[PDB]
Design a protein around this ligand. Structure first.
Ligand SMILES: *[C@@H]1O[C@H](CO)[C@@H](O)[C@H](O)[C@H]1NC(C)=O
Lengths: 49, 49, 48
């Protein structure tokens, strides 16, 4: 709550359990390779509930 | 000299490792090589004086 | 022939196989296992 961001991207997608561990910069998998690849210089958070 | 990384040859390490894990080792190589170059240039300056 | 074996030997006697003189395409390796941990150290799985 102490920072000023230029713009924020909110990408929402429902996925399996292990795919939560799959999503991270510089990762791999059936989803991380052909469905959602995070940028290598990712600066943000991923939320999973 | 490997300088504490996987290998001492860049043209092999770039193809053996992807960027988001290879940048650390290539940074180790950069710091070692540039420290050696700093030593060389300082000694050359002393010899020139 | 090493990923759908049935009697992976116990840890105290770890079966070790030698693989040579073939072409390695690890797509079979990915699709033959619902991976839980792929921690590689000396080489990245991506450009493998
Ligand atoms: C080879 O893999 C298939 C696919 O999982 C499996 O059903 C089969 O049992 C395997 N072969 C043997 C001998 O277990």
């Amino acid at each position: 709550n102490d920072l000023c961001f230029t713009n924020v991207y909110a990408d929402s997608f429902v996925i399996k359990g292990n795919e939560v561990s799959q999503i991270a910069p510089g990762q791999t998998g059936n989803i991380a390779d052909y469905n959602y690849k995070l940028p290598d210089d990712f600066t943000g958070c991923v939320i999973a509930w | 000299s490997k300088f504490g990384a996987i290998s001492s040859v860049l043209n092999d390490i770039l193809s053996r490792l992807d960027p988001p894990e290879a940048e650390v080792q290539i940074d180790r190589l950069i710091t070692g090589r540039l420290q050696s170059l700093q030593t060389y240039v300082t000694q050359q300056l002393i010899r020139a004086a | 022939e090493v990923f759908n074996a049935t009697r992976f030997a116990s840890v105290y006697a770890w079966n070790r196989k030698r693989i040579s003189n073939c072409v390695a395409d690890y797509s079979v390796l990915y699709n033959f296992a619902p991976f839980f941990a792929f921690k590689c150290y000396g080489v990245s799985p991506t450009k493998l």
